[PDB]
């Protein structure tokens, strides 16, 4: 709600924070974001619907300082705001641009829907928002290189969930030509005060998955996340 001016204000703020992405027309960015989903049925959104926005949003970024995450948004952002040379998805133009927002159009109108928008599990899965996030996560993972770090909530009872966004799209789109190692950090939110959580079956599953792709798997516990920062 107040979505268009919010996208424009976020884009303009990001222009100022980064004089590298100053080379950006934010009305152009909003035009492409809009042309992605408006006047379409909100269950037929493909990924090429968003590709003009992806082209306007592709961004020079140190590929060896990417921090993925799955179900820990807050501590990952806390981290990337102290280790100021590492970046999450939400530190990009588009991630910063769409974070925590909701949007959807309607077939046969130029009207943005502020009434209701499709839920991903009760209605359909190819809605504007989830497809946007699928798309940007794919591209973000495709940019990564060298040693890629992913942070995981080690009190989530599936420390690595396959049907996660990280598990679904991000693990299978890290390129073995550029990435040598994926190293997980298992955050201890009081769970298993003493046990070694990298020995969890889901971490072993992720180890097998990323090793079928010719990429090394490392892992490391973080027992007390406070003094870690």
């Amino acid at each position, epitope marked *: 709600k107040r979505f268009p001016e919010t996208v424009l204000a976020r884009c303009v703020k990001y222009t100022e924070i980064h004089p590298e992405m100053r080379h950006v027309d934010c009305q152009s960015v909003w035009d492409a974001f809009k042309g992605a989903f408006i006047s379409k049925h909100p269950c037929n959104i493909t990924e090429e619907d968003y590709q003009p926005l992806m082209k306007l949003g592709t961004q020079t970024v140190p590929c060896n300082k990417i921090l993925l995450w799955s179900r820990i948004k807050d501590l990952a952002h806390q981290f990337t705001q102290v280790q100021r040379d590492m970046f999450t998805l939400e530190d990009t133009l588009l991630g910063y641009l769409a974070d925590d927002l909701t949007w959807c159009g309607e077939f046969n109108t130029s009207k943005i829907n502020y009434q209701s928008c499709p839920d991903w599990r009760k209605d359909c899965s190819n809605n504007p928002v989830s497809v946007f996030w699928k798309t940007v996560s794919r591209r973000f993972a495709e940019a990564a290189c060298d*040693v890629v*770090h992913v942070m995981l909530n080690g009190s989530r009872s599936k420390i690595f969930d396959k049907n996660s966004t990280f598990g679904s799209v991000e693990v299978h789109n890290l390129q073995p030509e550029k990435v040598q*190692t994926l190293e997980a950090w298992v955050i201890h939110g009081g769970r298993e005060d003493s046990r070694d959580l990298c020995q969890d079956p889901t971490i072993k599953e992720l180890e097998s998955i990323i090793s079928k792709r010719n990429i090394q*798997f*490392s*892992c*490391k*516990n973080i027992y007390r996340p406070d003094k870690f920062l």
Partner: antibody
Amino acid sequence: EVQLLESGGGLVQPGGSLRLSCAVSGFTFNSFAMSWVRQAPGKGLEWVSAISGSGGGTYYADSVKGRFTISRDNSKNTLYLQMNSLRAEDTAVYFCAKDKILWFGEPVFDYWGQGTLVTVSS
Amino acid sequence: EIVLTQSPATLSLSPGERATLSCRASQSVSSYLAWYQQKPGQAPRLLIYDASNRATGIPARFSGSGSGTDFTLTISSLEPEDFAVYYCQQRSNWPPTFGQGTKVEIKR
């Protein structure tokens, strides 16, 4: 008291192999990447290889690819460097080193072992 | 590979002068440059890391500056124990690399 102590020594024939060891104490071994860094006598420091805290991530210098194998036993607090097909050029003091950084990646070394001389000769 | 060129090969300075040691990079390593001190027979001792931060247990007369491709270590008030070879090291990308080193003699 952070301690890094390398083991053995080394006179090998060219084309032979040997295994360098290093025992650590005074820090959580498996919380850190480690690296082997060589120095020929009278020359500079050349980095050989790096391994992650879990032992799953490894990087090698092009000089030693296909011949050297970095390795690590975390239950024994020990870092290994296996060296096969040793050449005369591989003669050097080999140094154990610990990563200062809290994760795998391009390292800076805050602690070093004392070094072991490896001599490749007939 | 990134090549580090440490610019003064040698140095003989009397105790109490300041030593200015240089380290040039072939491409930009940003701030990812550290300094090590090596005394004869000993292993390197970490002095400075990531351009300007001096490591724990290091005197304040050791200071590091620079970025992009130009870096300097400063030994503000020499002592005869400062005799050593000093190396810079980058960690911008693989592989990590060292300079050829500057050996500094203390005069008397």
